[PDB]
Design a protein around this ligand. Structure first.
Ligand SMILES: Oc1cc(O)cc(/C=C/c2ccc(O)cc2O)c1
Length: 271
């Protein structure tokens, strides 16, 4: 699939940089024709078949195809796609409130964010989309100054359609947040996202990462072994029902882990 090959600078003006990654940079931008503001994600293309730098066109097209499907208040939306010899440029919804990461919470404040995350993931999983990269860095806010901000899931760079219940691909996500099946290179499905939500919930309530070791290999080994516990110093005033929610997500066997529908019916969440 080919994208718009006119010069993006003829239609948008860029401004403040919003984020920077290994093969992508995100810049605030403004469309000349409407004055409306967006985020332009510039993704570096691979320049040869066998190269390791840049993103393969297969991976870019999968991300764009997934982004084109989604329209939900808790997920970022795609406006337009451009390309040139060097980059594919996604013109994405502007989410300006910064990361949930940059932003310890009470259980009401945690659940207010968490319910929005669960609503967004329920939408994705309903469409058989696994995100595969859920972490606080990929949960942004629309306005960080209100008492209960509205969140958007970003970064569909690892997302995959799961039309056979599982996919057999390697997912190089962030060690602190990936499920054991990712660590062990096993078939992957929607369940991996539910583990990541469990990690996110643990951090939201305590300010501490449940599996984090001193090195990446330590973290991965801890994930695979389900080596975590609720430290009383951090959880002494957290309800047992909040701990129950986390415990039913941080489960090694994906078949025994709570699904997104289970998580919405769990007594800590269900109104
Ligand atoms: O408005 C903003 C601000 C910001 O810091 C990041 C983004 C989007 C990042 C992003 C979204 C979708 C995707 O497939 C990949 C991405 O990197 C949007």
């Amino acid at each position: 699939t080919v994208f718009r090959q006119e010069n993006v600078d003829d239609y948008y003006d860029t401004g403040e940089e919003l984020g920077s990654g290994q093969f992508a940079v995100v810049k605030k931008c403004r469309e000349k024709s409407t004055g409306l503001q967006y985020a332009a994600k510039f993704i570096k293309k691979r320049r040869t078949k066998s190269s390791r730098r840049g993103v393969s066109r297969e991976d870019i097209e999968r991300e764009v195809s997934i982004l084109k499907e989604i329209q939900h208040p808790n997920v970022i939306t795609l406006h337009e796609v451009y390309e040139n010899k060097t980059d594919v440029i996604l013109i994405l919804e502007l989410v300006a409130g910064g990361e949930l990461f940059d932003f310890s919470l009470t259980e009401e404040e945690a659940t207010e964010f968490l319910k929005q995350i669960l609503n967004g993931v329920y939408y994705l999983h309903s469409l058989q989309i696994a995100h595969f990269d859920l972490k606080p860095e990929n949960i942004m806010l629309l306005d960080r100054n209100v008492p209960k901000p509205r969140i958007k899931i970003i970064d569909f760079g690892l997302a995959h359609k799961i039309d056979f219940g599982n996919e057999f691909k390697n997912i190089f996500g962030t060690p602190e947040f990936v499920a054991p099946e990712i660590v062990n290179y096993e078939p992957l499905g929607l369940e991996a996202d539910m583990w990541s939500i469990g990690v996110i919930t643990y951090i939201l309530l305590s300010g501490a990462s449940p599996f984090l070791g001193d090195t990446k290999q330590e973290t991965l080994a801890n994930v695979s072994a389900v080596n975590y516990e609720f430290e009383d110093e951090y959880f002494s005033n957290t309800s047992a029902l909040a701990k129950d929610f986390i415990r039913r997500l941080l489960v090694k066997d994906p078949k025994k882990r709570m699904t997104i529908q289970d998580s919405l019916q769990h007594p800590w969440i269900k109104p």
